[PDB]
């Protein structure tokens, strides 16, 4: 969250929150309804965001859904879409919080260990999130898409 | 038991509906590759 992030930054310096930090918090709470609308949008169209993005992924990376691919077979394919659903939900957590720590603490710390243990090609996961970013962006205005894109790009930049 | 969130069963219908196309069986042969001449040179 933006509030927690600034508090931990201020506590790390054993100081009260600075005026700059307090102004950022004030703006975030006062622009709160606009962010929740974006999260409401992502949440409501989560079925189509994941399905279309997942459909695009397998077209972009047919090997992962071929014999010997990590997502070969309908059941493995389902787990891949589940994982995409996980990451979309995390993006909506980041949107309403104004901070990436909820995304990081839930689904990016140790992600490389998890996916290498499973054998999943992580960069294809970065691609799947990338695909969700286009589908989501095309369901909202450019300014709203920009706000959500920052969090999509953070997930993409970390796994990739 | 009732399915809960995160369970991949929830996405089997989406997987079946997407019905992704697997690649065709490759026909590549190791024995017919000249490694030295085929590796790219830049």
């Amino acid at each position: 969250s933006i509030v927690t992030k600034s508090i931990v930054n201020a506590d790390a310096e054993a100081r009260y929150l600075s005026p700059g930090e307090l102004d950022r918090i004030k703006a975030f709470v006062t622009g709160g309804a606009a962010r929740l609308r974006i999260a409401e949008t992502l949440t409501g169209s989560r079925e189509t965001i994941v399905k279309q993005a997942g459909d695009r992924l397998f077209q972009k990376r047919p090997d992962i859904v071929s014999p010997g691919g990590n997502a070969y077979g309908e059941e493995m394919t389902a787990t891949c879409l589940r994982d995409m659903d996980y990451y979309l939900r995390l993006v909506t957590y980041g949107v309403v919080s104004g901070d990436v720590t909820p995304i990081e603490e839930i689904g990016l710390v140790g992600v490389r260990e998890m996916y290498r243990s499973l054998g999943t090609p992580i960069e294809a996961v970065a691609q799947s999130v990338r695909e969700m970013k286009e589908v989501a962006s095309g369901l909202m205005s450019s300014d709203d898409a920009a706000e959500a894109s920052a969090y999509f790009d953070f997930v993409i930049g970390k796994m990739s | 038991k009732k399915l809960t969130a995160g369970n991949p069963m929830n996405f089997l219908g989406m997987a079946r509906s997407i019905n992704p196309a697997a690649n065709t069986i490759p026909k590549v042969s190791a024995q017919n590759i000249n490694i030295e001449a085929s590796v790219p040179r830049r």
């Binding site: 070969y72 077979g73 059941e75 493995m76 787990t79 | 991949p8 069963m9």
Partner: peptide, 4 residues
């Protein structure tokens, strides 16, 4: 690979 099956999860069932």
């Amino acid at each position: 690979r099956r999860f069932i």
